[PDB]
Every structure is written in structure tokens, then in C-alpha cells.
Design goal:
Chain lengths: ~110, ~45, ~800, ~130
RNA sequence: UACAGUGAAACUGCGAAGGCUCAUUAAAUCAGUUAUCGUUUAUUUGAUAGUUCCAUGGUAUAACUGUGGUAAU
């Protein structure tokens, strides 16, 4: 998958094409607003916590915050029927959108 | 349309008539095209 | 208007005449407007051709959008603006708007494995993976072109390495340079400028061949001789290919038409239509066969066989992943899984796909069976076939989309799919002393991939050796092992002093899943915004929670492969393994003695593999610790994967002893749930964990025997009464199914049990019943061995009672 | 696995009849272990305590922590509350059939997995209370 | 050296503010006329606003930057 990670107070962000799905398997069934640990996802970002905010899957569809159901659903927004992906991140994403708030033990050269 | 140029590619009896790394393309197209006939094996006596 | 060149249209003309593919490699910046010109010349030389074109890419398009509505509305507002006239279009827009293009991703290139294309446009150069190239050019048709668009940087790299051997500054990969040197070798490739100039630096001269398939009229004559029944309608439907493929299809029809049990395993290449002949003979089976058939490919992997069976039905007489339910207008055939249909073998007809030899021997036992073995292990399959079925095993490897091309030779070369399994050493009697000597050499992969004919010969021998009888790896592993930075190899081939040449008895592959080097490569690959290249370091540090394996480096065995000739080849492989342990403890030429006398700083060294019998024997010769496993049976062979490593560093005592102890604790509890395979090698691996604890720990990682209070807390006094009842009486489950788990755990934890008691404890650790495991493994005297095991149970009763109270 | 093909709802009925018979004779004069910390550290190792608490308070694999999925369900059976849904999931794990086997039987895979995660999290809180109280 | 003339994309004010085909409604359609203290009424037009005990009020957000997904609005 891809991880688009953003640090707020400096105002910076970078993406990684991360292979080897067993590191990304920590994220399964962990909804928007849930905090994660750096251990199961990396060895080179340990001490790294992120708050997810969903992300566009394949077919470019967003994840509107706080409903249910990691599949696609059809609902009403600004009041027309439009399809979205759910709240929970699932197995077939394109990008997960992360915000890093605590720095860890291996420094970054594009974000930090 | 044969005998004429669909695109810019006019068809003669056999010929093909077309109409349309800067220094690298310049050298490779001008002089360095057939230069690698004897540059292939490079002292490889198998 | 300007005339271009005498070589580039003449290559296309003789290619579409003699049915051979060609390669155009376009360089430059304005490189999009030039491909429809080549398409029009390819069509004008031969109108009788396939029409569709592939435009695979990796991430993005050139300047276009692959959406006719998008470029229509964009050019509509361009007309509304008014910088472009109303009736206007350039030839690239004519190409994408008029022709039929399939734009597939390089990542999802697997979705086009069977259909045919008249053109293939490999867009980006920098990720050109050999599985993708071997998937594309095998489907490009015989009068076809493949086009490759290059870069400014890749044009600089070609201009660099087209003098003799040079390389570029700032992972590094050499498979792209091996592909450029492969196309320098092939004369069926030519590099073309943006202005349609030709680079003669690869395939310089080419002529117009003279103005004009004797086998194809012979195929028509074969079709006519079969024609002038339902077998003739099927044969005239089937023979869309070479006459050898027609012969194999008609011989399979006549073999399983009137007969009822032969077993024929025909081997075909990626060409020649093995599944095509099978699917076309399926209608001959459905007419002159039983009303029930048995298909044995993998699940949702036989859509081509379904297409050919449907085309055969339409030609003769008709009317959680997919829809694979069978049809009938008049019989049933369904794509079964692994051998669960051993009860439903009342069908007479059965056929299978390529390769588990035991699972192929299991389900295909009491009916008329065939197999289709693909090239893309078959020798051992045919040997187990001949050692067991009126064997009419016949399939052909004639080319189906061409007669044979130099581009097909370049496909075999740059995909490294050519093999020659002759020994060609000095002697086997001079190689046994070479295994006794164990003098190994390093790879030097940059010069190994630097392709000279000597280097291509050495790489050919090592490549066929490594891919020979493996666990079915692929060109992804080929490109990985060709361009991974944390990788090397080792080969101790000849001990004798003959001339230029040699052999390779056994190759090995190490993967430095390190701490310092892998930390450096991870910090480098994060700048490249990609990278996940540490498996053995990541699996054990999460499974067994190893701070020590996290803080140390590690070496994981990617592969190890020797011959299958005799036990002496695996003896030479064990000698090369001991020589690698000796090497870790104790331009340029494509071998090394200095790096064979140099080493790195690694924290452990070992390999992961499936829990196999012979691999467990190699792990015992290895005797390196068989650590904690994962119970996941991989869907290919049903085998669970585990990692055995040795701590070859300064202080790996605590790490090795702790991981082996936790693995020995976990193997008894995991030995019931999803690991109940066979008692012998599993108890031998339990003894391997115990000997690993003996080697790595002395007095720290040692638990005592269960106390008086622990033995009185696990069982009760009712257990002692029922134990005396089973001692002096019968031994049914009324008193031995309460304490069996505690008895098994205490027996394999804590004074000695013999072979029969250990087999009984193996059945009780697999939680099996009475006459299954005992009369399956030892296979004699179930009641007598059960009463002797019950005598051992009475011994354990006296053991616990005398130990506690 | 003395039967290995007995039913989970029948097992809940058997546990209910055994529980009624053990709870109502007059009063049960046979006490269990009310948080013995040395006994908890003796049955499960400190590696087992850290592994169960890690798979609770983070995401690890149920297949990577199922070594504590055998004796802990029996400990919740004999010696905390588990209603007859999570009790039936634990009874299927005690019959050693798969979580997929009980999940594609009753609700769903992620359903029974998150219910067993709730049960193991309550068992992790129980062992945490014992190991903190002594 | 806090705004300065042209100025590619947005909102605003306004604009499109009045036109095809099919079955055949007899003072119910339509017209003139009374009323609306029985009532809605932007616009036009005429008039028409008196309750203060111990130097000027807080963030949310576009445009703008930046990282990305999608064959794609």
C-alpha cells in the first residue's frame, strides 16, 4: 500500500510505497481516530505514532469519517446519492493518510 | 489511403517517407551510429 | 518529408513475411508521436494481422489520458478557446482515438496472460521485470513489433555501457543493463531516435528478404485426412496450431476415447497450447466418454481450459471468486481442489495440471487420467510415473505464435529460461574430493551480470542449478537475486586444475537481513520512498519478541540448490554449507578469493523453509536451531514454514537458548491445533529444539521437574485411582482422557520414555485416537502396542505418585 | 478431541447443566484459585503474560498468540464473565475446531475474531489485576 | 521595501424573464365588471423610530502552499 504521513507543526509530509503486507496487517479493522504503534509496521520507524484519517482506495473513493463498514456504501452528502468507502480501513486500499505526532528513534530527512 | 500519406508516412515502391541528452542524441545520430560494430565483444576470448 | 532508412522497414517486412517478432527501442523527448508511424508500416506490410495494441505502464501516462470523454471535452474547450482549428488531429491522437489499446499496469500485468496482441508498448524502462517481459512477448503475435520508450537518463546509461562495460554513478540494478546487452546481442532489435534515425549500435545491418510455411499446409493436409465424425469436427476445430500439437490432440482423443486406466502426462511449453488441446479433447471425452469428469487444476486458474471446452462444445454440439458451475444441453465436470474427492472417484475421466507429486498420485488412482505439465520437477514426476497407466504421455514444444524468433531467443536469454542439465564437470570422482575440500568462491554479482559468453555460460550453469527442482520460484526471484543489494552467493565447484571452464555442484543464496547494513539500506530506500526487504529479521522479532535479534544483524537463506542426481550432490551441498560457516567464522573477474577470504559482521546465520522431511534432515545436518514456527500451510503444497538459524557471533547464547526454549514450549501446544503432520520428524525436531537448548544454554535456561505440589495440582487423587484402574485393568477413555494433556506435557517437558511411548505421546500430542496413528506409522499390533503403551502409562502413574507422594 | 465432532451449542448446554449441578447442590464447598499470582506465573510464563497483553493492547495475530487459546478458555470455564456467545466461541476453541470454522458457522470471521478479542482482553484485564495485586 | 497599470481560473451583481407535440373543453374556456374591512404583494411612489447599579468584540476557512489516490468528470 502507500502511506501519506504528515507532521503538522513544521508543515511537512511524505509518501512511502510500502510492500510486504505483513507489516501493514497491524492496520486492519482499526478505524479513523485510532492511534497506532511503530513496532508492527516498521523497524525503521519505531516510537512513531499516527492518527489515521482514512484514505482513497482503488477507484479513488474517499473515506468519510466515522460511520462503519470497510466496503463501499451509497449515502447522501452535499443531498445527492454518492458512493464512498466506509470508516474502517480494509485490505484493498491505495493510500492511508497518517499524522505523526511523536518522533522516534530513527530520524527522517524528508518529513523532519 | 495507400499511395498517399495517412499521417505523414508516404509509401513509395519500397521507401518510407515520413515528416515530423541533446549532445548525446546529436553524436549518436550524426557520427556514433555504426561505431559499435567493433565495440561488441571487447577482448572476450571465450 | 524525408526518407528514413533501409533497415527499419525491411526488418518489419521480413518479420511479417517469415513470422518473427521485432523490437523497436525509441529514445528521445518527443517520443509519443512516432509509434503510429511504425503501426501503419506494420499494418501496410501485412493487413492480415492482429489489430489490438498493448500500452502497459507502471504509474502514469505520457501526456494523454486513456479516456475518450476526457480528451474529447478537453479538446472541446480547446475549440471553444480558439487556438486550434476544428478539423485537426495529430497522429498520436489518431492512434489513441482510433485503434484498440489495452492499457494495463505493470503491477497488474497478470490479467492478460492468454489473449493475443499485435503490438506491445512497454512504456517505462526503469522497472522492466522479467516476468512481465516473458508475459508480454509470449503473447505478441508472429508479425509483431514490441516497442520500448527510453529516458534521457537511460539514454545516457546506454551511451555509457555501449563502449565496452561501463556503469552509471547513483538500490543499483544490473538487470536493465543485462537487457541492454541482450538487445545488443540480438539482431532483431534496433534503437531509433525521435526523428526516426536508427542507432546501429545494436543490430546494425538488416536486409530486405526475398519476395515469397510448408508445415502449415501439412497441418491442413492432416485436418483433411482426419475430416474425410464428431472426432473430425473436433479435430478441425482443434488444429489451429502446429501439426505436432494436432498430433498430440488427436492422439489424446484416440487414447481416452475408446479406452477406460491409462495415465498420460504431456509436457508443453508456454506455447503449443497444452490447455488448448486438453479443452478441445474435452468434447471428445464428453461424447465418447463417461458422463462424469474430474478436473484438477488450481481454483479459478483454468479459464483458458473453460474457453477451449466451450469452443469445442460450440463447434460440435451446443445448446467466491467466479462462476465455475458446469453446464449441460445433454454429464458434469467441475474444477476440484486438493485430494478431497478420493470418495468421489466414480468418474472415469480425470485430468490434471502442472506441479505436489504425492497429491497428484493420491487423487488420480482408480480412473483414466492425464496431466498437462507446463514449462513457463517434471523429470521426477515422469520417473514416478514410469516406476508405477498405459503411458501415452506425449506433448509437443513447437512454437504456436511463431515458427521461432531471434526475439524468442532473446526472451529465453533475458528471462534466463534456457537450461542444459548435463554435468560437464571434471569428474564425479574428482568432485567427491571437491566436496571433501570445500573451497568456495564469492559471486561478484556486478561482473557476473556483466554478460560475456564465459559469464553467460557460468550464469547459465548457476541459474539452471538454482532453478532446478526448487520450490517453484519465478522471474521475480530472478530479478531480485540479480539486483538485491543485501544478497550474495557461494559455489565450491572444481578442485582440479583443468583449463578454462568448470561446473557448479551446489549454489547457495544468502540475504543479509542486517542491523547496520539494513539500517543504512532502509534510510536510503526511504529517500526512494519504497523498500521492504527484511523477512527473517522481521518475523522472529515479532513472533518471539527478540530485542537481541533486533539489535544484531542476521543472515537468511534465500535458497540453496544442488543436483538431484544422487545423495553425493546433497553431500556436496552440506560441504558448501559447512564451507560457508567456515567463511563466516574463519572491470573485475566474476569470482573471488579475497571475498572468499573476507566476511561481514552478522549476528546469526540460517534458513527458513517448509516443514519437509528431507529439508528437516538437511536442517539436522545443519543442526542449527529450529525456532518458533508459523502454522500457516501455504496453498501450493500444504506445508507450514519455519526458520532454523544458528547464532554465529560473539554472544548469541542468551538469544539462541531463549528462542529455542520458547519454541520448544510452543511446539507442544501448537502440535495439536494446526500441526499434526507425522510423528517422526516432528519428535525429531522436538529433539532438535532440546539439543539446541543443550548447545546454547548450560544452567540458565533450565526448568526443574514438576514439584509434589505441581503434580498434586495438575492431577488429583481420583487420577491416581483411575491410573491404578488402567494399570490393573483395561485402558479405555474413562480415566485416560482426563489426564492425557497433563501426561503429554509432563512427558515431553520433564525420567525417560522409549520409542513406543514416544509414538504414543506423539499421537496424544496430535490429540489423535487409538488405532489411527499407531497402526498408521508402525502399522502392526495395535492392541499389543496399546497395552505396552498402557504399561508405560502405569509407569508414568508410578512416576508421578513416587515423585510427589 | 475425545469426540472432536460434538456440537458447540450442545457444549454450552452441557456446561450449563454442569454449572447448575455444581452451583446448586447445597453450596459448592470446592473453591477455585481467586487470583493466585505465583500460580498464574507458573501456569503461563512471563513471556505468555507479555505476549497476551501485547496482542490485546496492540495488534498481533490470533494465530501468533493461540498458545494461550487452550488453557485460558478452560480457566474461564472453571475458575470474570463470558456470555454464551463468547463462551461458545471459547468452546469451539476448546474442541479445537478453527475460529474460521466457528465463525463461518455462526456469525462471520471478523465478527467472531473481534468477539474473541473482547474475551481475551477481559482475560488480559483479569491477569493484569492479579499480577498487579501481587 | 504594508495597496499601485495589463492580468490565464473562482465567487459575487445580472443574464437565458417565455418555446414542441398529442387526445378534442360549449358562458365552467374566455372577455367586460363589482368587491376583497375575505386577501399575498419584491419593485415604483408618498409619509412615518426615545426603558443603560460594581477610544471599537472571539475563532472557522476559502483562495494560496504541499503530499497523494483514480481508467476517470
Amino acid at each position: 500500500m502507500k502511506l501519506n504521513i504528515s507532521y503538522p507543526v513544521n508543515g511537512s509530509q511524505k509518501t512511502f510505497e510500502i510492500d510486504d503486507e505483513h507489516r501493514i496487517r497491524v492496520f486492519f479493522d482499526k478505524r479513523i481516530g485510532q492511534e497506532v504503534d511503530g513496532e508492527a509496521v516498521g523497524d525503521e520507524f519505531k516510537g512513531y505514532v499516527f492518527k489515521i484519517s482514512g484514505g482513497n482506495d482503488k477507484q479513488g473513493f474517499p473515506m468519510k469519517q466515522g460511520v462503519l463498514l470497510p466496503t463501499r456504501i451509497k449515502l447522501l452528502l452535499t443531498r445527492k446519492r454518492k458512493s464512498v468507502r466506509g470508516a474502517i480501513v480494509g485490505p484493498d486500499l491505495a493510500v492511508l493518510a497518517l499524522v505523526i505526532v511523536k518522533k522516534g528513534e530513527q530520524e527522517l530527512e524528508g518529513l523532519t | 489511403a495507400p499511395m498517399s500519406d495517412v499521417g505523414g508516412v508516404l509509401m513509395d515502391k519500397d521507401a518510407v517517407y515520413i515528416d515530423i541528452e541533446r549532445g548525446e542524441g546529436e553524436k549518436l545520430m550524426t557520427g556514433l551510429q555504426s561505431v559499435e560494430q567493433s565495440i561488441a565483444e571487447k577482448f572476450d576470448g571465450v | 518529408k524525408k526518407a528514413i532508412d533501409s533497415r527499419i522497414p525491411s526488418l518489419i517486412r521480413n518479420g511479417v513475411q517469415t513470422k518473427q517478432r521485432s523490437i523497436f527501442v525509441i529514445v528521445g523527448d518527443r517520443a509519443r508521436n512516432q509509434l503510429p508511424n511504425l503501426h501503419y508500416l506494420m499494418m501496410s506490410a501485412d493487413l492480415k494481422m492482429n489489430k489490438s495494441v498493448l500500452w502497459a505502464y507502471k504509474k502514469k501516462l505520457l501526456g494523454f489520458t486513456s479516456h475518450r470523454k476526457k480528451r474529447e471535452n478537453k479538446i472541446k474547450k480547446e475549440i471553444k478557446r480558439g487556438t486550434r482549428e476544428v478539423n485537426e488531429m495529430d497522429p498520436f491522437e489518431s492512434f489513441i482515438s482510433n485503434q484498440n489499446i489495452r492499457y494495463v499496469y505493470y503491477k497488474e500485468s497478470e490479467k492478460i496472460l492468454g489473449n493475443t496482441y499485435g503490438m506491445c508498448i512497454l512504456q517505462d524502462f526503469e522497472a522492466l521485470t522479467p516476468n512481465l517481459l516473458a508475459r508480454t512477448i509470449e503473447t505478441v503475435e508472429g508479425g509483431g513489433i514490441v516497442v520500448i520508450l527510453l529516458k534521457s537518463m537511460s539514454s545516457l546509461k546506454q551511451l555509457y555501457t555501449m563502449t565496452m562495460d561501463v556503469h552509471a554513478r547513483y538500490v543499483v540494478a544490473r538487470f536493465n543493463e543485462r537487457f541492454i546487452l541482450s538487445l545488443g546481442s540480438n539482431p532483431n532489435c534496433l534503437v531509433v531516435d525521435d526523428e526516426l534515425n536508427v542507432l546501429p549500435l545494436s543490430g546494425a545491418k538488416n536486409v530486405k528478404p526475398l519476395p515469397p510455411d510448408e508445415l502449415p499446409p501439412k497441418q491442413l493436409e492432416l485436418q483433411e485426412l482426419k475430416e474425410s465424425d464428431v472426432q473430425p469436427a473436433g479435430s478441425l476445430v482443434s488444429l489451429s496450431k502446429t501439426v505436432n500439437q494436432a498430433h498430440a490432440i488427436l492422439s489424446f482423443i484416440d487414447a481416452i476415447s475408446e479406452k477406460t486406466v491409462a495415465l498420460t502426462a504431456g509436457r508443453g511449453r508456454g506455447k503449443s497450447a497444452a490447455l488448448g488441446i486438453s479443452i478441445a479433447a474435452a468434447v471428445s471425452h464428453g461424447y465418447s466418454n463417461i458422463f462424469v469428469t474430474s478436473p484438477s487444476p488450481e481454483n479459478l486458474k483454468t479459464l483458458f481450459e473453460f474457453i477451449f471446452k466451450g469452443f469445442d462444445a460450440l463447434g460440435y454440439q451446443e445448446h467466491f471468486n467466479k462462476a465455475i458451475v458446469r453446464v449441460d444441453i445433454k454429464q458434469y465436470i467441475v474444477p476440484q481442489d486438493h485430494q478431497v474427492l478420493g470418495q468421489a472417484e466414480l468418474v472415469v475421466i480425470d485430468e490434471a495440471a502442472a506441479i505436489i507429486v504425492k497429491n497428484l498420485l493420491g487423487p488420480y488412482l482408480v480412473f483414466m487420467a492425464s496431466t498437462i505439465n507446463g514449462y513457463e520437477l517434471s523429470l521426477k514426476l515422469i520417473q514416478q510415473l514410469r516406476n508405477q497407466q498405459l503411458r501415452e504421455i506425449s506433448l509437443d514444444e513447437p512454437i504456436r505464435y511463431a515458427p521461432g524468433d531471434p526475439i524468442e531467443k532473446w526472451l529465453n536469454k533475458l528471462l534466463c529460461l534456457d537450461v542444459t542439465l548435463i554435468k560437464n564437470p571434471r569428474f564425479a570422482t574428482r568432485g567427491t574430493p571437491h566436496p571433501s575440500q570445500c573451497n568456495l568462491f564469492v559471486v561478484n554479482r556486478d561482473t557476473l551480470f556483466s554478460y560475456h559468453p564465459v559469464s553467460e555460460n557460468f550464469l547459465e550453469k548457476m541459474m539452471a542449478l538454482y532453478v532446478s527442482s526448487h520450490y517453484k520460484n519465478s522471474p521475480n526471484d530472478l530479478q531480485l537475486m540479480s539486483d538485491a543489494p543485501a544478497h550474495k552467493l557461494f559455489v565450491l565447484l572444481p578442485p582440479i586444475d583443468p583449463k578454462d571452464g568448470g561446473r557448479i555442484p551446489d549454489p547457495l543464496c544468502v540475504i543479509q537481513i542486517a542491523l547496520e547494513g539494513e539500517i543504512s539500506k532502509e534510510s536510503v530506500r526511504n529517500s526512494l520512498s519504497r523498500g521492504q526487504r527484511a523477512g527473517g529479521d522481521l518475523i522472529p522479532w515479532l513472533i518471539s519478541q527478540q530485542f537481541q535479534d533486533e539489535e544484531f544483524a542476521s543472515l537468511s537463506g534465500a535458497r540453496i540448490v544442488r543436483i538431484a542426481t544422487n545423495p553425493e550432490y546433497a553431500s556436496m551441498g552440506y560441504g558448501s554449507r559447512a564451507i560457508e560457516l567456515l567463511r563466516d567464522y574463519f572491470l573485475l573477474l566474476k569470482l573471488s578469493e579475497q571475498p572468499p577470504h573476507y566476511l561481514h559482521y552478522l549476528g546469526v546465520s540460517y534458513g527458513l523453509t517448509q516443514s519437509l522431511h528431507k529439508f528437516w534432515k538437511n536442517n539436522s545436518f545443519v543442526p542449527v536451531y529450529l525456532r518458533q514456527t508459523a502454522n500457516d500451510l501455504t496453498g501450493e503444497h500444504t506445508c507450514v514454514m519455519l526458520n532454523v538459524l544458528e547464532g554465529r557471533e560473539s554472544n548469541w547464547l542468551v538469544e539462541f537458548a531463549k528462542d529455542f526454549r520458547k519454541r520448544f514450549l510452543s511446539l507442544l501446544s501448537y502440535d495439536f491445533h494446526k500441526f499434526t503432520a507425522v510423528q517422526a520428524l516432528s519428535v525429531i525436531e522436538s529433539s532438535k529444539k532440546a539439543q539446541d537448548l543443550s548447545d546454547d544454554e548450560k544452567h540458565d535456561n533450565k526448568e526443574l521437574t514438576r514439584t509434589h505440589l505441581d503434580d498434586i495440582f495438575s492431577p488429583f487423587d481420583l487420577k491416581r485411582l483411575d491410573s491404578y484402574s488402567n494399570n490393573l485393568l483395561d485402558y479405555h477413555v474413562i480415566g485416560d482422557m482426563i489426564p492425557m494433556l497433563a501426561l503429554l506435557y509432563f512427558g515431553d517437558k520433564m525420567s525417560s520414555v522409549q520409542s513406543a511411548i514416544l509414538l504414543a505421546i506423539g499421537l496424544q500430542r496430535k490429540n489423535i485416537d487409538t488405532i489411527a496413528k499407531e497402526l498408521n506409522l508402525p502399522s502392526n499390533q495395535t492392541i499389543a502396542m496399546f497395552a505396552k503403551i498402557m504399561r508405560k502409562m502405569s509407569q508414568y502413574f508410578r512416576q508421578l505418585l513416587s515423585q510427589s507422594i
